[PDB]
């Protein structure tokens, strides 16, 4: 957990409905998004951060949490949008004599910033007496090994955790769900869906001066008034179709 692995996912179509076939977990824990809607969205990037904790600490893998893990080992941002997947791995990560291949950081001078990894093995100095790298009074070793055994209770058994963080920026989308894209229809009232941005309106050719890095435009009420087509990089103006009041 103190040296949690991180993998970057980009330039691919992500089908989140096969994640049930890879790990024997019971449900997602998705913050800011719903697990069933993941296949209908495009994200600029995905990050899969994997590690092992024990049962008690699975509750700490969540935005706004505090503890040993959330402070010194693995911290999630308060504005987190993603999904946490944790499953019991007592059959794999537990030995009869004890599994001491998994460790956690117990002491640290200050709390971790979100998504910060600290792999320093320096001796922690609780007091003022210098340690000079040697354990002693008020000189602790910050890393402590979990002792995982098959006879431990469900709260003390190992749990494998994978955190998926969805970077949804203004950049062009790179990770999308399986979704076939139809032909572009202009000058007609249609239900459009650009990279998961859904709406209803009339799409017209535009002469707005989008800079090469921009991808969409907003309005006074933060309503998307222009878009960039993901395939043919042109600028489309979105207009409400047609409506009015009718008096008798």
């Amino acid at each position, epitope marked *: 957990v103190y040296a949690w692995n991180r993998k970057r996912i980009s330039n691919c179509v992500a089908d989140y409905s096969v994640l049930y076939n890879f790990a024997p977990f019971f449900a997602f824990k998705c913050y800011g998004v719903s697990p069933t809607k993941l296949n209908d969205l495009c994200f600029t990037n995905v990050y899969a951060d994997s590690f092992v904790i024990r049962g008690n600490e699975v509750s700490q893998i969540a935005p706004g949490q505090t503890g040993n893990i959330a402070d010194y080992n693995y911290k999630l941002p308060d504005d987190f949008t993603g999904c946490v997947i944790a499953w019991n791995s007592n059959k794999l990560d537990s030995k009869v004599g004890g599994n001491y291949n998994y460790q956690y950081r117990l002491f640290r001078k200050s709390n971790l910033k979100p998504f910060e990894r600290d792999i320093s*093995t320096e001796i922690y100095q609780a007091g003022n007496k210098p340690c*000079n*790298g*040697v*354990a*002693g*009074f*008020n000189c*602790y070793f910050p890393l402590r*090994s979990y002792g995982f055994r098959p006879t431990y209770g469900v709260g003390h058994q190992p749990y494998r955790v994978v955190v998926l963080s969805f970077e949804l920026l203004h950049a062009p989308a790179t990770v999308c769900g399986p979704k076939k894209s139809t032909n572009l229809v202009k000058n007609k009232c249609v239900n459009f869906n650009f990279n998961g941005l859904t709406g209803t309106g009339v799409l017209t050719e535009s002469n707005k001066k989008f800079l090469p890095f921009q991808q969409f435009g907003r309005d006074i009420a933060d309503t998307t008034d222009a878009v960039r087509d993901p395939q043919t990089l042109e600028i489309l103006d979105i207009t409400p179709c047609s409506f009015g009041g009718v008096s008798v």
Partner: antibody, heavy 126, light 107 residues
């Protein structure tokens, strides 16, 4: 508990170096300090240095710095101590021991060396 | 830079007697003192760690106390197998300085 097994005896000459192995049976490796304590014939014990295998380096007392090198082989679960520039005062029994360091919440309880090797008699022949 | 001083260096007692050994530190080490028992030809064994705790398997006759700079190891009833050399070690800070060692002999 954990069992420590060292190598055999050594016969050397002043100006040479000696490498002593200490294989741990196992159970907390890469987090347990493998301390080395030497004992001169008819004299008291003396602490040379300690190594935590995950640190990579080795810490030593302010009497052996500069001529003691301790390294750990994680794959073989063996700790190696290399004492260079041997002299007459380097003939002793060389033990390897494992620290525990149980602390409750304030400083109660300290370190102790429960497992000791059988001892590696190193003789610096003249 | 912490030194440990023992007293006495060699005491001769009988079986069933009470033995008191003192271990003094130059400066306060809290409760990071240990007591080791070494028999000739063998590696030392732990009897007291933390100045007040008994290791697993240690007979109840051994008892340690004290804190700061004054410490004491006490054997309530001496035994024929309790004649050995006793070393007190401080775990406060590097270096771990062993005491001069007290040798308990048969009267």
């Amino acid at each position: 508990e954990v069992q420590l097994v060292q190598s055999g005896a050594e016969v050397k000459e002043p100006g040479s170096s000696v490498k002593v192995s200490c294989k741990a049976s196992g159970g907390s490796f890469s987090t347990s300090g493998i301390s080395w304590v030497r004992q001169a014939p008819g004299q008291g014990l003396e602490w040379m240095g300690v190594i935590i295998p995950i640190q990579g380096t080795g810490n030593y007392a302010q009497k052996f710095q500069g001529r003691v090198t301790i390294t750990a082989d994680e794959s073989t679960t063996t700790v190696y101590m290399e004492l260079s520039s041997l002299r007459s005062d380097d003939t002793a029994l060389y033990y390897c021991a494992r620290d525990q360091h149980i602390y409750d919440s304030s400083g109660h309880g300290g370190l102790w060396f429960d497992p000791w090797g059988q001892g590696t008699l190193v003789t610096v022949s003249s | 830079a912490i030194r440990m001083t023992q007293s006495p260096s060699s005491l001769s007692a009988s079986v069933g007697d009470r033995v008191t050994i003192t271990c003094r530190a130059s400066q306060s080490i809290s409760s990071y003192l240990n007591w080791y028992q070494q028999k000739p030809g063998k590696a030392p064994k732990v009897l007291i760690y933390g100045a007040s705790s008994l290791h697993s398997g240690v007979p109840s006759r051994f008892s340690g106390s004290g804190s700061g700079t004054d410490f004491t190891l006490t054997i309530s009833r001496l035994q024929p197998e309790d004649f050995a050399t006793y070393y007190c070690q401080q775990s406060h800070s590097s270096p771990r300085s062993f005491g001069g060692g007290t040798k308990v002999e048969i009267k």
